[PDB]
Amino acid sequence: VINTVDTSHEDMIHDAQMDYYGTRLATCSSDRSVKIFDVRNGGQILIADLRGHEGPVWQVAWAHPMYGNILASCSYDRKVIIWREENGTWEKSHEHAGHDSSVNSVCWAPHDYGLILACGSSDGAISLLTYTGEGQWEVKKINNAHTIGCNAVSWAPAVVNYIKRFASGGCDNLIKLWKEEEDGQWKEEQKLEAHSDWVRDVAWAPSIGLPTSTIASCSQDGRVFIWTCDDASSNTWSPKLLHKFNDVVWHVSWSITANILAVSGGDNKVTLWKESVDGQWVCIS
């Protein structure tokens, strides 16, 4: 079925992500506002209209319900705002202004890792807002993460204490994979370089228990790659060109089982890709 939602925004939409339970939808636009709808039973209830940003809001990311109703938003105004809902209302809860350029993407860490939000800014700085209770956040900034500027950040699923890894894609035409050391410092470990233009969105594939790590990354030119790592010990990623697009590709999103990829590009077209038995990704839409 189709549940069409009228955003009622004052400008073009830049992202739209529903909650973990799939009941509440939060959208962001250039109108400096974030609207959280209630799309249960195909409804439209404007639960809140959060306006705390001085610039356009790029990406929103719900948190796991294990930590409560938490929404994160990154905006062009160098400002990261975390909205937590309490007593039936959505209100500003935490404020982050550690970046000197526009924060492009926010992606919450898996709930096993705790309550960690990774932000990527256009200045090449990556900040991880670890949460330690009592309503304070500690920031472990990864300075100079990318030469020109980080565009997207995606976390690696908890795989077996816990080794925390995430993928970053910047404007330096490359993908950087990060892991924290034993002390806590985050050190670059492997560099991925196959895109001929800006890496706009890197998205890890959620793990289902398979011994294979998959990364889908889109680029400014229009190249979408599938970075498979069949052997964890080898830690070698072999890119596979999913498709060559005539325009820019903006966002890539995996399924819950990581078998269907939602490739959305600048041509105002949304394509669903499923891997065939022959190893070639074929469009479904």
Partner 1 sequence: GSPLDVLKDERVQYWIENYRNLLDAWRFWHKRAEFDIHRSKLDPSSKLPRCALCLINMLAQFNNWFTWCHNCRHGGHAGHMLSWFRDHAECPVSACTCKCMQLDT
Partner 2 sequence: DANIPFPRTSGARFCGAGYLVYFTRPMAAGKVIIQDIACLLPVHKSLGELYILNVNDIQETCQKNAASALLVGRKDLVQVWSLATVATDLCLGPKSDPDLETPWARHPFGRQLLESLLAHYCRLRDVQTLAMLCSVFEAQSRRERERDQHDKNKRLLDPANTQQFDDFKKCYGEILYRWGLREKRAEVLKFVSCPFQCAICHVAVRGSSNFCLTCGHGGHTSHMMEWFRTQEVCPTGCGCHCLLESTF
From the list 93, 130, 228, 253, which residue makes contact with partner 2 (rule: CB under 8 A)?
A: 253
d(CA 132, CA 18): 26
b/e code 191-204 from CB counts within 10 Å (16+ = b): ebebbeebbbbbbb
Burial class (CB in 10 A: 0-12, 13-18, 19+), 39: middle
From the list 1, 66, 160, 277, which residue makes contact with partner 1 (rule: CB under 8 A)?
A: 66
Q: Between 138 and 270, whose beta carbon lies closer to partner 2?
A: 270
For position 151 contacting partner 2 by CB under 8 A, the verdict is yes
From the list 56, 79, 145, 164, which residue makes contact with partner 2 (rule: CB under 8 A)?
A: 56
The answer to whether the beta carbons of residues 218 and 249 sit under 8 Å apart is: yes
Pick the piece of the chain touching partner 1 (CB under 8 A) from 64-72, 141-149, 217-225, 231-239.
64-72
Binding mask 123-142 for partner 2 (x = CB under 8 A): x-------------------
Pick the piece of the chain touching partner 1 (CB under 8 A) from 27-35, 62-70, 156-164, 219-227.
62-70
Q: What does the angle CA 25 – CA 29 – CA 30 come to, to the nearest 5 degrees? A: 170
Instruction: Tell me how far, at minimum, the Cβ of 257 lies from partner 1, in Å.
Output: 22
Q: Which residues contact 87 (CB under 8 A, 6 or more apart)?
A: none
For position 154 contacting partner 2 by CB under 8 A, the verdict is no
For position 68 contacting partner 1 by CB under 8 A, the verdict is yes
Pick the piece of the chain touching partner 2 (CB under 8 A) from 177-185, 186-194, 238-246, 257-265.
257-265
- Per partner kind, with CB cut-offs from 5 to 8 A, the member of partner 2, partner 1, none near residue 68 is partner 1
What is the three-class DSSP state of 62? strand
For position 65 contacting partner 1 by CB under 8 A, the verdict is yes
Largest CA distance in the chain: 52
Within 13 A of 172's CA, how many CA atoms are on the CB side?
18
Residue 61, both tokens? 């990311």
Walk across the sheet containing 57-62 and list its strands.
57-62, 70-75, 80-86, 89-96
From the list 115, 171, 192, 202, which residue makes contact with partner 2 (rule: CB under 8 A)?
A: 171
Q: Between 42 and 68, whose beta carbon lies closer to partner 1?
A: 68
Pick the piece of the chain touching partner 2 (CB under 8 A) from 45-53, 201-209, 222-230, 236-244.
201-209
Q: Between 43 and 68, whose beta carbon lies closer to partner 1?
A: 68
Pick the piece of the chain touching partner 1 (CB under 8 A) from 63-71, 137-145, 199-207, 269-277.
63-71
d(CA 16, CA 246): 24
Integer CA distances (angstroms), 265 to 13, 148, 220, in order: 14, 22, 9
β-bridge mates for residue 129, sequence order: 117, 139
For position 47 contacting partner 2 by CB under 8 A, the verdict is no
The site for partner 1 (CB under 8 A) is made up of 65-66, 68
